């Protein structure tokens, strides 16, 4: 389903995303905002066998598995089906797996496109937390 920034920012907060790898909570909200538009049921296709899954659009080729995508390395070791859940736990974990260095966030297209270098805080501003 479609969360709320404050609604989700809360869960990401509860799930260890606040200042993870020095990444302000704003960032984690802005991502889901544009990638999935706050929808856990989001599913988008690519220009290959890939299909991005969930609120954080985790990729069927390198991260989760969907037994229908060529060259599936499944680095998060998880079926893409677990990412379309109403529980952002599954996703958040895998998401923590991508961000490896401290610049891992660049991975999200939308984040890198309409989040980097913006007032990302604004996304969490107004939430009780």
């Amino acid at each position, epitope marked *: 389903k479609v969360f709320g920034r404050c609604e989700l920012a809360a869960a990401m907060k509860r799930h260890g995303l606040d200042n993870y790898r020095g990444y302000s909570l704003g960032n984690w909200v802005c991502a889901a905002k544009f990638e999935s538009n706050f929808n856990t049921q989001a599913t988008n296709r690519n220009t290959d066998g890939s299909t991005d899954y969930g609120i954080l659009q985790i990729n069927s080729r390198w991260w989760c598995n969907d037994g229908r995508t060529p060259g599936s390395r499944n680095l998060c070791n998880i079926p893409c089906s677990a990412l379309l859940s109403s529980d952002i736990t599954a996703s958040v974990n895998c998401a923590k797996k991508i961000v490896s260095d401290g610049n891992g966030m660049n991975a999200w297209v939308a984040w890198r496109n309409r989040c*980097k*270098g913006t*007032d*990302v*805080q604004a996304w969490i501003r107004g939430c009780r937390l």
Partner: antibody
Amino acid sequence: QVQLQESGPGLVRPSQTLSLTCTVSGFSLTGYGVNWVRQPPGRGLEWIGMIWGDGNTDYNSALKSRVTMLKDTSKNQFSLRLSSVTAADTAVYYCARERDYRLDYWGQGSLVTVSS
Amino acid sequence: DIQMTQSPSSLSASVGDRVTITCRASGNIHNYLAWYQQKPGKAPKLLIYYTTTLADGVPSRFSGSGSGTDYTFTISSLQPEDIATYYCQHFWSTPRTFGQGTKVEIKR
């Protein structure tokens, strides 16, 4: 390889317009923003304002009607124009890079003083 | 406009002592507080962000705790290489404001 270097005049006649330059390197002029802060000789650190990665500006509510900030993805430089300088605009202007709510890379700072 | 009120204006202690500087915010800044260290002659350098999180290379002597409007920064063991002025700056919406900075120094 993150470097900032401010350049500008040292001496400036009052009523004239102050205009320093900040030339960066080692990072994206669009994924990071830049803050200008000044510091009068002996006094503390005053925040003059910023220009977000997305070309946006925000000025301190005092110097607002007289500071203009510009980006120039051409020579990798940001510009600060301080208009009609009295003599308390005498200071060391810094230009720092803002990384996710923290000024982590700072210029060396250039002194600018208004005579008379 | 959230103002930053930092105290003390300067302090003196012996190496080995814990000193504590504080920043009280005119409004809730929500942990978005940062601490810089400045030695005579050069720009300020980052030490801590998001209230407790320290920059790379920073020694452990330093720390920072705080929430709401009350924030505090601690040098657990004043060492000769800590003598500088320390400031705070909030990052809760704009504009940001710096505390006036404390000037730490060696007793005697």
